[PDB]
Design a protein around this nucleic acid. Structure first.
Ligand code: NA
Ligand code: NA
Ligand code: NA
Ligand code: NA
Lengths: 206, 207, 207, 205
DNA sequence: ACGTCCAGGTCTACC
DNA sequence: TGGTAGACCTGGACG
DNA sequence: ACGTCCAGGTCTA
DNA sequence: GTAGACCTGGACG
DNA sequence: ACGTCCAGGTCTAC
DNA sequence: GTAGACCTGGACG
DNA sequence: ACGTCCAGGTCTACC
DNA sequence: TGGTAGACCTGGACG
């Protein structure tokens, strides 16, 4: 079933948007360290939150993610109506240790290894949001596994149950099921995601 | 307790001034830039199984080059500067550049002991000996440099029963502890301390 | 990994029988009076910073003396029978006599972990270790005895990064849980598990 | 170190060593057959145990002299000696000097006699030759084995545990000890028992 | 030798 | 609070 | 007189 | 945990 | 447990 | 001057 | 209405 | 350990 649904989206004029988006990421090969970092923050802000809200907050704050004091930045987040302003603001500041994120990430063996580094070395980033970062900046063979695509995987029965938790072991299992699915629909991991996400919500945000 | 006898022997000499101004030299790194810090990390990598002064010279000649120099070029520089392991050390140095702002990364940690834990497992080229070396050099007080010299100095006074071929983190941590006890006894920080014991051996107070 | 290996080969050795005859020696406390249990509780108080062997004869020579002998005479016996702390341990034993029906008090508690909590804050001389040691010695399994020894090899086998100064309740229940997983990876209750781990370093199977 | 030895000359141990040193002197009146059994004992102590060789020397007894090659190798084999084959061979070959007492005594001193033994018997080098001579009553040869050597380096008398204790080694060390000797006022033989006991807490031979 | 090392921790008293 | 330095205290093993 | 031993360890398989 | 690999010039007798 | 540690060196070749 | 060989059997954790 | 639902998780403390 | 509970924390649409 899921296969069928995606097949027709690849046909529908939705495929036209997903690739203005997929390439919207690829262009990060020509973006600055601040931009890349601003994307990392977007991921940190997105966890257990809303994409729309995340987009606003990002555009509204801009390079404030990289110049605002912990107390001043914290307040702005309070303004734009973010669920968790205290915590997420703490992560932003703390993350500045790696403000040259583009150079740090582009220097790893691959993407699977780079993801490993962000998780354990950035408070606020698990596998969900690291995969999200990598993707949003050009990376194809990583999967983002949040509530939604979980739901489409439990629903279409690819997974037994919606895990009370997501160990690294499980994330890499599922991410693979996702990978094998994408060979049939013939999409890289970065693309597929947007497709399943769109089904679920009805928006090719990011 | 002969070592100790020789330690206080030094504390009451014109050597204490040299060491005391040497320690102050490191403590000034609190104001230096990320560059002056990365360039110090490299010096350590250079000094691994090499000459202390041999690494002091190369650091002078290359200077801000540790940041810019490409692989094949920096290799030429080193190869010409007479370093033993030009290829390998050149390799490591370049990789370390992914942390070209090594100050933001180090000061972000809660304590030096944990900061070392990071450096040791994210920078190929750095183990405990040369991270302790690194940190100490940029102004931290509570870490020990457990090289060959201070090792068979300990050993030579029965602080240990053998010179182990390789140092386990548990092994290095245990040895360090041992040094700190001397530290308390003689009243000095593992930073100060290390310059002393090092001097009892070689006769020079470099770094 | 090595520790895991040492264990199972013991489970196949002559030792897998001495420990077993020993484990059911504890379970047989379900059919003993308060006094016999108290005698055990007393044995554990004697063991704090002392020998397991020593506390076994002292309890055998003194027998049911922990219940009748006045302080002065008890301390005297504990002095003659050569106990490290003949005064303090003599005091604890007397104060505990306000629970000389210890069996009725312990079995009353829903379980074991909750009963252990009662022994610790309500009896001088009994900390978390010599509390778990008592319950285990009277037939309880899901509690670990974390003494100088089982600490030595947990640290030697890289399970913990240090031998802590003193064991806090959180640190105890934490390490106790580290042992609890070690248990299921070889299939042994903490009680039985303890004896294997203890025989490794001491080379004996007492209690 | 010297402080420790003084503590020993104080203890009951000093009496234990006096009666032991006098057990060696008795060889002045023992037979060629006896002097040889000690020689064999010393051949069974090289890279082996002092206590092990003792019981072996006691069980085998005069067997070192009358048992055929293969027979002697069996008793050594059974008595759990590390090297039954070789030691039996060394013992058998040495039987050509069965009247070892006559030969040793005929020499000028101990220093020259030991030289003959070493060169003229397979299985015997300096330590064993010294060991031998000490055991029969001779007083100024040092036995340099793993322990008296251990003690000497741990105490900064020598600087390396030489891989190969050369004759030129054995004798520089032997001289050092002889100087450690005047410090405490002991014969090389008495001193060896003192140093050995420190290492081993046993005082046999 | 004589001193060092070491045994299935728990307690008070301090800040 | 809750983490920690000192007190309790002795006999045997071992170089 | 040319050969040996020494220098602030770390990484891979 | 460990040996081989990385690599060189330099002072000593 | 079983694998390493350990014990009063001497010989034979290259 | 120096590896390999001779060769094992108890203790120990 | 206004009490429910829901949104691209991850960290700490605890065992 | 590595899993689990519980915190972080709110707005906006539903009906
Ligand atoms: Na993280
Ligand atoms: Na490293
Ligand atoms: Na208590
Ligand atoms: Na010979």
């Amino acid at each position: 079933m899921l296969i069928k649904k995606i097949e027709e989206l690849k046909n529908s004029e939705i495929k036209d948007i997903i690739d203005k988006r997929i390439q919207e990421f690829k262009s990060f090969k020509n973006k600055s360290n601040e931009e890349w970092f601003k994307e990392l923050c977007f991921c940190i802000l997105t966890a257990n939150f809303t994409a729309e809200g995340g987009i606003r907050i990002q555009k509204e704050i801009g390079d404030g993610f990289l110049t605002l004091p912990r107390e001043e930045l914290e307040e702005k987040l309070k303004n734009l109506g973010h669920r968790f302003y205290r915590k997420r603001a703490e992560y932003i500041v703390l993350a500045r240790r790696f403000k040259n994120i583009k150079d740090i990430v582009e220097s790893f063996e691959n993407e699977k290894v780079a993801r490993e580094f962000l998780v354990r070395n950035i408070k606020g980033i698990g596998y969900q949001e690291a995969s999200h970062f990598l993707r949003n900046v050009g990376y194809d063979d990583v999967a983002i596994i949040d509530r939604h695509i979980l739901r489409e995987l439990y629903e279409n029965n690819y997974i037994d149950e919606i895990p009370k938790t997501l160990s690294r072991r499980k994330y890499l299992e599922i991410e693979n099921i996702l990978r094998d699915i994408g060979e049939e629909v013939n999409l890289k991991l970065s693309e597929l995601d947007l497709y399943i996400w769109y089904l679920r919500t009805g928006k090719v945000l990011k």
